[PDB]
């Protein structure tokens, strides 16, 4: 058996850590760790007005593949969930949300951080920021 994958979503709809935490937590396991990656109003010393995430058509499948890999490695992890928002985002919005339920907290903390790491590394999505001075930037281009 591998851990449950309760949610794996690329969506334009708003995402909530709250619902995701409730979903993984149904196992009634010992420990739940959640991550929310939220949009800051500043970046690299510049004030951000808004941003947009775009996705390659293979993004959803890539996210699913990542989730399967993470779910396989068995450290007493019972359930995982991850979502990335795409489209227009406002300051404060959650861009990336993950949750992990485990028998004990060590596996929950380590697995949740690793899941977020691998998602950021492999997910074919792009970030377009817009600054107060009227300029814009495609992150990492």
């Amino acid at each position: 058996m591998s851990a449950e994958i309760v949610r794996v979503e690329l969506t334009e709809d708003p995402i909530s850590l709250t619902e995701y935490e409730a979903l993984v937590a149904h196992e009634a396991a010992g420990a739940v760790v959640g991550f929310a990656g939220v949009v800051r109003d500043h970046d690299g010393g510049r004030s951000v007005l808004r941003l947009e995430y775009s996705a390659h058509p293979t993004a959803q499948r890539t996210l699913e593949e990542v989730a399967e890999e993470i779910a396989a490695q068995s450290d007493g992890v019972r359930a995982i969930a991850v979502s990335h928002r795409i489209g227009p985002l406002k300051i404060g919005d959650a861009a990336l949300v993950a949750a992990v339920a485990a028998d004990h907290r060590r596996a929950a903390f380590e697995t949740c951080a690793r899941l977020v790491d691998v998602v950021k590394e492999r997910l074919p999505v792009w970030k377009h920021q817009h600054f107060a001075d009227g300029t814009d930037e495609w992150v990492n281009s």
Binding site: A95, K120, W126
Partner: protein
């Protein structure tokens, strides 16, 4: 003599190219690297963005840029990722 390739630009590449896609006639056997050169001739900005791009042929990652294009194909232009 030639083969028709569909090019899909993404994110920064699309922004620099001014378009999301185009169809192109290239000499049969043209490598992906040679294609990228011809794509970059459009404008210096696109040429600049292309330097750091990766590529898919029919959504399969291009490991060798010397890969010959010998059949009608879709080439995706992928800037460095930036998500999370």
């Amino acid at each position: 003599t030639t083969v028709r390739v569909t090019v899909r630009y993404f994110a920064a590449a699309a922004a620099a190219a001014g378009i999301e896609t185009e169809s192109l006639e290239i000499a049969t056997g043209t490598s992906v690297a040679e294609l990228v050169e011809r794509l970059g001739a459009r404008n210096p900005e696109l040429a600049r963005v292309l330097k750091r791009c990766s590529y898919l042929c029919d959504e399969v990652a291009v490991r060798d840029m010397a890969k010959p294009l010998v059949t009608p194909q879709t080439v995706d232009v992928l800037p460095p990722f930036a998500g999370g």
